[PDB]
Amino acid sequence: NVFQPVDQLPEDLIPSSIQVLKFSGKYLKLEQDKAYFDWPGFKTAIDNYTGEDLSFDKYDQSTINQQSQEVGAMVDKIAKFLHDAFAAVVDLSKLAAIILNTFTNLEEESSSGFLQFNTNNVKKNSSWEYRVLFSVPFGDNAPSYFYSLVTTILITADIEEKTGWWGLTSSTKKNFAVQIDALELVVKKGFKAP
Template sequence: MKFPGRYMKFDDTNDNKHFDWKDFKAAIDRYPALDLANFLFRSTVISQADATVSVMAKKIATFLDDALRAGVDLHELETNIEATFTHLNEKREKEVADFYPSTEEGRSSWECRLWFALPNEYLRNYFSCMVTTIKLEANIEDEESWVLQGSTTQDFSATVDSLKVYVSKDFKGLHI
């Protein structure tokens, strides 16, 4: 599966890419067939000055599992999120993360994009898809200084947006 790349927008003024939630949600809402259905969108900000990368990953995973009833292995989700944060340049090469300078002095951020599918226990011909963006911001001024480990603390905050949709096994996605 690939992240819904059609909704990645490029801003010429600052050379940044970001996921366009507004357009993505609108496309799903107006999708005419029954093989794709918007189920649940949730958003939160997690901010804790003394949190480590590991703690932030755990809080984000817990939010996703609680708010969206994700039904995933919580430890595995935490591990994947932490691995994303500790390998940001590798994730950028895979086009699932991008760096952003901040207007606030001494801070910057990364937008990380996660996309995964799970079996749907209630509708056997459908699966649940989770599309998630995490904007991880920290007291790190430049991109080269974003070398994180699980124990790193840098006054982290994370904005997490996630949408759970039901997708038919026959879904072709031609019009989305």
Template sequence: MSGEDPVYFDQFSKLPPNLVITAIEVTKFAAHYVNLEDPKSFKWQEFLDGINSYPGKLIVPNSLQIKCDDLAMDKFQNNTINQQTATVQTMVDKIVDFLRVVLSVALSGADIAALAKNIETTFTDLRTAKENGWADFSKSSSSNNSSWQYRVQFAFPNPDLPDYFYSLVTTIKLEADIKEESSWWGLESSTQKNFSAVIDAMQLIVSQGFKDPRKPV
């Protein structure tokens, strides 16, 4: 992205160089749907509406009629990990297990390890993630709890179509029995808390050359 474009999504990519620019365009498109009022959060329904209104030919992925040409929604799934006493590492492993189910590609052991490391690094360095723009703190309904929303796009090649790739636009809300924002600083993989998580993930099929159809945020 250029220095003028706000960055509201982290990127985890296994794409070849010729598809990287297109993946950046997807994150720019998704960034329009981040609610900028504190606490920042991603507006999933508006994002879906934006995809539905994206001009192009009519295609039918998984019986969902969506107008698009070089961008198509393939599926949307969410998962809740109920509150439990667990370490950060345990929560990361559970999150990755879910993402592996959603993704339509077979991940290698190295890919799985890199995916887990990316998520673990985010939640053990939330101060940096917030400064980068892709994680935001919020208080929870329980006065003793608070949470973070982490926004990220995971991008993997389509093994059958070299000009296409899978984009998994994802939000991960991690909640714990932590009251203050600063008390999240310095979590380690072995830190144990009463954690819960909500993961929302939309898989898109994207072809090379897609461009964000909206003006910069």
């Protein structure tokens, strides 16, 4: 699970979600005991694919340059972007919570493979390479079809040791800089990882 499976789509679709999940998980620029999503590889891969069951339909970025803001402040912000950037899927604060939960529960969540930790030898700082795979239904108007928003969030902040981020809170303030990438897809039942 190199991404985090968040899907409000109905069961019969989840298995296809899984396939979309698996397709993406294949693009990692692993190197240095660390693994980071590979946007060029995962783009070109898409921009080639011959199929009706999977179709690229959008990309976008956003840069929240460092500043002393508090967790739940940047999160509800990140949410704003994904929401707006893709008023095609994301909506309300109902996501600002799934993200915030990750952050305030960082310690454990780390155990998983969709969170890559790394520090800067000298700047004495760190960041989190966080991958999340949102995928919701297209609607009762296209049962077979569903949305899949592959997102990659990098949170950089003036913290040094890994236990550094343990126990953060909605309120905690830090110097956070975050790059946000999210490539939206349109999938149909049956999509299988080529």
